[PDB]
Design a binder for this molecule. Structure first.
Ligand code: CL
Ligand code: CL
Ligand code: CL
Ligand code: CL
Ligand code: CL
Ligand code: NA
Length: 129
């Protein structure tokens, strides 16, 4: 599913991401924009053999099981395929664990490089939330 901008903002808010670990909703929408262009079915293969899945491009080395990432973990206790669903619950619940890991949203390199320190509230402007 490709979410609209305000549609994803509302879904993220409904699932409790607004201000989660102190990160305002615009931070989460901005991260999703540059990770996946709001497409739940986005995937990306990394040089080390791991794969990133879903709207927030969550990686199989630590967070989900795809059966093809040797030596990896599954800390969100989900198949990586669950991160591709039209229902964002699995991506949100796993992102909450990731952002609590110690480095906040810096875990998403694209957030650090493209969202951090910017006017992220622009990503939710105009939305009925
Ligand atoms: Cl957009
Ligand atoms: Cl915001
Ligand atoms: Cl594996
Ligand atoms: Cl599994
Ligand atoms: Cl933080
Ligand atoms: Na894994």
């Amino acid at each position: 599913k490709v979410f609209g901008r305000c549609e994803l903002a509302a879904a993220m808010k409904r699932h409790g991401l607004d201000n989660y670990r102190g990160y305002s909703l615009g931070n989460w929408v901005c991260a999703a924009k540059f990770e996946s262009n709001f497409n739940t079915q986005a995937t990306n293969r990394n040089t080390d053999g791991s794969t990133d899945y879903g709207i927030l491009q969550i990686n199989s080395r630590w967070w989900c099981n795809d059966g093809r990432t040797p030596g990896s973990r599954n800390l969100c206790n989900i198949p990586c395929s669950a991160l591709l669903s039209s229902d964002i619950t699995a991506s949100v619940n796993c992102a909450k664990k990731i952002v609590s890991d110690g480095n906040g949203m810096n875990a998403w390199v694209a957030w650090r490089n493209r969202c951090k320190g910017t006017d992220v509230q622009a990503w939710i402007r105009g939305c009925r939330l």
